[PDB]
Design an enzyme around this catalytic site. Structure first.
Site, PDB file in Angstrom:
ATOM      1  N   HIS A 312       0.828  -1.183   0.000  1.00  0.00           N
ATOM      2  CA  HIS A 312       0.000   0.000   0.000  1.00  0.00           C
ATOM      3  C   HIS A 312       0.878   1.255   0.000  1.00  0.00           C
ATOM      4  CE1 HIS A 312      -4.007   1.984   0.599  1.00  0.00           C
ATOM      5  NE2 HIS A 312      -3.157   2.887   1.105  1.00  0.00           N
ATOM      6  N   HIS A 468      -7.209   0.828   5.427  1.00  0.00           N
ATOM      7  CA  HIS A 468      -7.208   1.735   6.593  1.00  0.00           C
ATOM      8  C   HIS A 468      -7.843   1.137   7.829  1.00  0.00           C
ATOM      9  CE1 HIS A 468      -6.658   3.899   2.915  1.00  0.00           C
ATOM     10  NE2 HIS A 468      -6.184   4.974   3.597  1.00  0.00           N
TER      11      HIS A 468
HETATM   12  C1  LIG Z   1      -2.750   5.385  -1.520  1.00  0.00           C
HETATM   13  C2  LIG Z   1      -2.937   6.180  -0.192  1.00  0.00           C
HETATM   14  N1  LIG Z   1      -2.024   5.746   0.847  1.00  0.00           N
HETATM   15  C3  LIG Z   1      -2.230   6.452   2.073  1.00  0.00           C
HETATM   16  C4  LIG Z   1      -2.152   7.964   1.773  1.00  0.00           C
HETATM   17  O1  LIG Z   1      -1.135   8.473   1.065  1.00  0.00           O
HETATM   18  O2  LIG Z   1      -3.062   8.728   2.240  1.00  0.00           O
HETATM   19  C5  LIG Z   1      -1.046   6.106   2.982  1.00  0.00           C
HETATM   20  C6  LIG Z   1      -1.373   4.938   3.961  1.00  0.00           C
HETATM   21  C7  LIG Z   1      -2.109   5.686   5.177  1.00  0.00           C
HETATM   22  C8  LIG Z   1      -1.866   7.086   5.065  1.00  0.00           C
HETATM   23  N2  LIG Z   1      -0.803   7.149   3.890  1.00  0.00           N
HETATM   24  C9  LIG Z   1       0.415   7.923   3.956  1.00  0.00           C
HETATM   25  O3  LIG Z   1       1.239   7.809   3.129  1.00  0.00           O
HETATM   26  C10 LIG Z   1       0.553   9.100   4.943  1.00  0.00           C
HETATM   27  C11 LIG Z   1       1.792   9.395   5.554  1.00  0.00           C
HETATM   28  C12 LIG Z   1       1.774  10.559   6.327  1.00  0.00           C
HETATM   29  C13 LIG Z   1       0.678  11.381   6.420  1.00  0.00           C
HETATM   30  N3  LIG Z   1       0.826  12.585   7.260  1.00  0.00           N
HETATM   31  C14 LIG Z   1      -0.593  11.122   5.783  1.00  0.00           C
HETATM   32  C15 LIG Z   1      -0.631   9.927   4.995  1.00  0.00           C
HETATM   33  C16 LIG Z   1      -4.425   5.990   0.140  1.00  0.00           C
HETATM   34  O4  LIG Z   1      -4.852   5.161   0.865  1.00  0.00           O
HETATM   35  N4  LIG Z   1      -5.433   6.898  -0.422  1.00  0.00           N
HETATM   36  C17 LIG Z   1      -5.143   8.027  -1.459  1.00  0.00           C
HETATM   37  C18 LIG Z   1      -6.408   8.574  -1.782  1.00  0.00           C
HETATM   38  C19 LIG Z   1      -7.554   7.515  -1.265  1.00  0.00           C
HETATM   39  C20 LIG Z   1      -6.915   6.724  -0.242  1.00  0.00           C
HETATM   40  C21 LIG Z   1      -7.273   5.230  -0.585  1.00  0.00           C
HETATM   41  O5  LIG Z   1      -6.613   4.684  -1.555  1.00  0.00           O
HETATM   42  O6  LIG Z   1      -8.148   4.554   0.009  1.00  0.00           O
END
Ligand code: A1IJW
Ligand SMILES: *[C@@H]1O[C@H](CO[C@@H]2O[C@@H](C)[C@@H](O)[C@@H](O)[C@@H]2O)[C@@H](O[C@@H]2O[C@H](CO)[C@@H](O[C@@H]3O[C@H](CO)[C@@H](O)[C@H](O)[C@@H]3O)[C@H](O)[C@H]2NC(C)=O)[C@H](O)[C@H]1NC(C)=O
Ligand code: NAG
Ligand code: CL
Ligand code: CL
Ligand code: ZN
Length: 571
Positions: A312, A468
């Site tokens: 992910h 998530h």
């Molecule tokens: C692929 C995208 N990946 C997430 C993300 O980048 O949000 C990842 C995993 C959880 C959060 N994240 C991070 O990397 C992060 C690191 C530091 C931060 N301060 C905030 C986030 C995503 O899930 N997304 C993107 C849009 C929809 C959602 C999903 O795919 O369900």
């Protein structure tokens, strides 16, 4: 007051060191899931928890009522929240082990023919994106839920109990209250309610038109023109974005569209190329380039050494102001190009606020952190820019592009809204393990108008099959993101001197747009998020009016189209 200043300064220096070590261990586990990386991670968990306890205990002896400097006040108030480090040591260890076990389960789940075994990235993702056979889509959709979601269920009740226990020990009523607190907006629930209600015209008209197109392809016996759409037909595992079924729903098949995937592949694009273009867009705006160390340390494609990784996509701040990385199992397609931009936005925020005290190193609210990359990626997606990258070559093309954008941005509005409506009710106790899955499908129906293609049974835990949930990452940030990013694009496009329809704007190379973004990001979490909203947009509220303005010609087209077909909107 001088005692309070010295305390934050000590908290800051010691936090850099400890969070750097933790970030390192968490990285090594995510990029190499082994017994040993697990072990070191769980150990560094206890180490950061000891730090948090030490400084959080001290922080709570300050009466912040009695403190003058408002930045010191605010840091101290934040350090008084110990999060999970408030738990007694036994629960803390069990909690950390639960989290680890959940993430690992999700990230290593496979779905097997009786035959070879498919992983979520890229195999099952590609099945949902490209298959047009109802029963193959069903196999992937059901299999993923049977393998990942059911396996998370045994952990979830204890997760909920421990995260809520931590929340209460920090002064919240439950973990959901704690998460909502991060916006510092007491009218949050109602504000987001009204925002979602404003996008209902667009979503229901989009929903009805896609439902009709599915009816045409999959047959009248599989689609009820007055009912919910089956959840496996939208081109995505969670039906959160529908742009992979563009082929089924093209408004103007006469204006043929370029296969962007084939174009990328044919033109030799790589994951590195993808990231270099995102870096280009950012520096075009006069924003910061990622450092050389970014390119040497990031993991931009899935390892080929058989190693288990967390695929992910995620962005990583190592808390030293120099080491920033991305870990993504990048596929060469436009969908992941957009994800690369997304992740690059989180890198750019880390670089922009790197000189703040670590307590204030977050976005103005979590929504702002998610929005930055997306704002750029809206300009990247235009025909003007895709043309320039050699990935594309009329009113017709216009309505088609808006359709392509609406399948991603409009469709995700109810999904992004519903995820934490469900988790907030799990946290507050009004959904129990007896009805986790049934309440999840009631919200799937109520907000997105989807139904499960196969009836769910006891033992199913479909939320577990979305990243998530096992990873314990809040989701309302994404709803906030989707609204505000249009507000940001609208204001940036105005800053850039764009005229004419908002959807034709491309802010590439605009130093005016860049400066607006940079000054906002530099705030980190130092002030209430309205100020960062006002800096970018000239006003302080969240508002759906920019997203509505962007989609307006599509809303008119959809109503004419749905009207002539007699669609009954809704379900
Ligand atoms: C692929 C995208 N990946 C997430 C993300 O980048 O949000 C990842 C995993 C959880 C959060 N994240 C991070 O990397 C992060 C690191 C530091 C931060 N301060 C905030 C986030 C995503 O899930 N997304 C993107 C849009 C929809 C959602 C999903 O795919 O369900
Ligand atoms: C309330 O306190 C904040 C924070 O104070 C800073 O941290 C404390 C814990 C102590 O270590 C303080 O000595 C320390 O200054 C004050 O904010 C700080 O104000 C100064 C301006 O005086 C900011 O400095 C600037 O830095 C930039 C970029 O590096 C320079 O280009 C500028 O020209 C300028 O010198 C500093 O950023 C700011 N810090 C933060 C994180 O906000 C705040 O002023 C104070 N308020 C009151 C009531 O006086
Ligand atoms: C992966 O983890 C093992 C076990 O901790 C370690 O010894 C090894 O060096 C790591 N290898 C990779 C591919 O980084
Ligand atoms: Cl689901
Ligand atoms: Cl959030
Ligand atoms: Zn993100």
């Amino acid at each position: 007051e001088a005692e309070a200043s010295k305390f934050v300064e000590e908290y800051d220096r010691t936090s850099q060191v400890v969070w750097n070590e933790y970030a390192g261990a968490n990285w090594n586990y995510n990029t190499n899931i082994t017994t040993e990386t697990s072990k070191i991670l769980l150990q560094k968990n206890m180490q950061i928890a000891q730090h948090t306890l030490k400084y959080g205990t001290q922080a709570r002896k300050f009466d912040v009522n009695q403190l003058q400097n408002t930045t010191i006040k605010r840091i101290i108030k934040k350090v008084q929240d110990l999060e999970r480090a408030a738990l007694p040591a036994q629960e803390l260890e069990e909690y950390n082990k639960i989290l680890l076990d959940m993430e690992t389960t999700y990230s290593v789940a496979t779905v097997c023919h009786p035959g070879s075994c498919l992983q979520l990235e890229p195999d099952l993702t590609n099945v949902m994106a490209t298959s047009r056979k109802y029963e193959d889509l069903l196999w992937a959709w059901e299999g993923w839920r049977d393998k990942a979601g059911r396996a998370i269920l045994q952990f979830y009740p204890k997760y909920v109990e421990l995260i809520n226990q931590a929340a209460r020990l920090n002064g919240y009523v439950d973990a959901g209250d704690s998460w909502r607190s991060m916006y510092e907006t007491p009218s949050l629930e109602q504000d987001l309610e009204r925002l979602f209600q404003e996008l209902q015209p667009l979503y229901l008209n989009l929903h009805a038109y896609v439902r009709r197109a599915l009816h045409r392809h999959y047959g009248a016996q599989h689609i009820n023109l007055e009912g919910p759409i089956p959840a496996h037909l939208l081109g995505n595992m969670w039906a959160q974005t529908w742009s992979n079924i563009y082929d089924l729903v093209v408004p103007f098949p006469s204006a043929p569209s370029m296969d962007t995937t084939e174009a990328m592949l044919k033109q030799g694009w790589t994951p590195r190329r993808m990231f270099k273009e995102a870096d280009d867009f950012f520096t075009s705006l006069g924003l910061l380039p990622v450092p050389p160390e970014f390119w040497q340390k990031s993991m931009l494609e899935k390892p080929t050494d058989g190693r288990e990784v967390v695929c992910h996509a995620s962005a990583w701040d190592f808390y030293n102001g120099k080491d920033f990385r991305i870990k993504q199992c990048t596929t060469v397609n436009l969908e992941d190009l957009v994800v690369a931009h997304h992740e690059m936005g989180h890198i750019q925020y880390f670089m922009q606020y790197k000189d703040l005290p670590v307590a204030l190193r977050e976005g103005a609210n979590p929504g702002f952190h998610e929005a930055i990359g997306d704002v750029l990626a809206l300009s990247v997606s235009t025909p003007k820019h895709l043309h320039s990258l050699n990935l594309l070559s009329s009113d017709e093309h216009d309505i088609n592009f808006l359709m392509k954008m609406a399948l991603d941005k409009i469709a995700f509005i109810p999904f992004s809204y519903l995820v934490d409506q469900w988790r907030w009710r799990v946290f507050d106790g009004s959904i129990t393990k007896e009805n986790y899955n049934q309440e999840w499908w009631s919200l799937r129906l109520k907000y997105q108008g989807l139904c499960p293609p196969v009836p769910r049974t006891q033992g199913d835990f479909d939320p577990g099959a979305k990243f998530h949930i096992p990873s314990s990452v809040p989701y309302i940030r994404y709803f906030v993101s989707f609204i505000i990013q249009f507000q940001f694009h609208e204001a940036l496009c105005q800053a850039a001197g764009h005229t004419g329809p908002l959807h034709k704007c491309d802010i590439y190379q605009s130093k005016e747009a860049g400066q607006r973004l940079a000054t906002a990001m530099k705030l980190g979490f130092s002030r209430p998020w309205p100020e960062a909203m006002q800096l970018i947009t000239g006003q302080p509220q969240m508002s759906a009016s920019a997203m509505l303005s962007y989609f307006k010609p599509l809303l008119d087209w959809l109503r004419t189209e749905n009207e002539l077909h007699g669609e009954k909107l809704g379900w």
